[PDB]
Design a protein around this ligand. Structure first.
Ligand SMILES: [Ca+2]
Ligand SMILES: [Ca+2]
Length: 275
């Protein structure tokens, strides 16, 4: 039996599926710890590793690259879960090792690979309190080149009036994604700040795990792939739209949930975004 995780429904992805749009031909780079390319509920088209200690992008010792991949594009079939964009072309761009850690140089090499391989969408469920000019440059380059880049806002909660949004989410060029629960309340851990753009389900998100299993995780790192996946859905329905159009629709049609410091434009609604 296949389950549809609550988050997939919450963002209204099934509406697109019902229209015959599932992310076909859209190239999504999962810039993370790799993807277990053998998972029965995943199909991985290509990729590359930039982690010195881990040469194979199709093995995932962290679990998170595989989990993120499943939220984006877990296959529509009789098993497991269902991705926001179940027909999307997944690429495993390994820049984090099995500890979920990576150097900015590795991450940068991964973004460079995504650009030179003409990805349509980048998912970066990764963040730190700081970044670097070289990181900003390549991120901005990916976006100016035409790629939709979604990045996790961070799990640093609130701190009075100061931003707790991490990088690369902090860069204006990326879509910074915060986490709500199934009630549309911001999760207590969700980072806040003027850099916040949209929200997506990020509490107990069920997805694929290496080895052919499934499990749930909390975090903005799990909210982000809903937005990456939504971008792919939108592109499959509207192949001629630029990344700027895609982002504008996602933000402009979001469901208002509260003050933007905490919720950005609110919850993505891919049905409205792709209308
Ligand atoms: Ca499935
Ligand atoms: Ca941003």
């Amino acid at each position: 039996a296949q389950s549809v995780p609550y988050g997939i429904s919450q963002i209204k992805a099934p509406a697109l599926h019902s229209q015959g749009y599932t992310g076909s031909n859209v190239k999504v780079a999962v810039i993370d710890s790799g993807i277990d390319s053998s998972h029965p509920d995943l199909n991985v088209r290509g990729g590359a590793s930039f982690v010195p200690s881990e040469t194979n992008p199709y093995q995932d010792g962290s679990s998170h690259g595989t989990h993120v991949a499943g939220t984006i594009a877990a296959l529509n079939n009789s098993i497991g879960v269902l991705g926001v964009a179940p027909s999307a072309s997944l690429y495993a761009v390994k820049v984090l090792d099995s500890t979920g850690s990576g150097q900015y140089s590795w991450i940068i090499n991964g973004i460079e690979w995504a650009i030179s391989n003409n990805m349509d969408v980048i998912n970066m469920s990764l963040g730190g309190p700081t970044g670097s000019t070289a990181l900003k440059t390549v991120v901005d380059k990916a976006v100016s080149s035409g790629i939709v880049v979604a990045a996790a806002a961070g799990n640093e909660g609130s701190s009075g009036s100061t931003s707790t949004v991490g990088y690369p989410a902090k860069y204006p060029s990326t879509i910074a994604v915060g986490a709500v629960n199934s009630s549309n309340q911001r999760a207590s851990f969700s980072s806040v700040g003027s850099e916040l753009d949209v929200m997506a389900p990020g509490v107990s998100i069920q997805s694929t795990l290496p080895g052919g299993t499934y499990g749930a995780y909390n975090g903005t790192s799990m909210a982000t792939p809903h937005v990456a996946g939504a971008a792919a859905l939108i592109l499959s329905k509207h192949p001629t739209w630029t990344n700027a159009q895609v982002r504008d629709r996602l933000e402009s049609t979001a469901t208002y949930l509260g003050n933007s410091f905490y919720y950005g434009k609110g919850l993505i609604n891919v049905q409205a975004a792709a209308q």
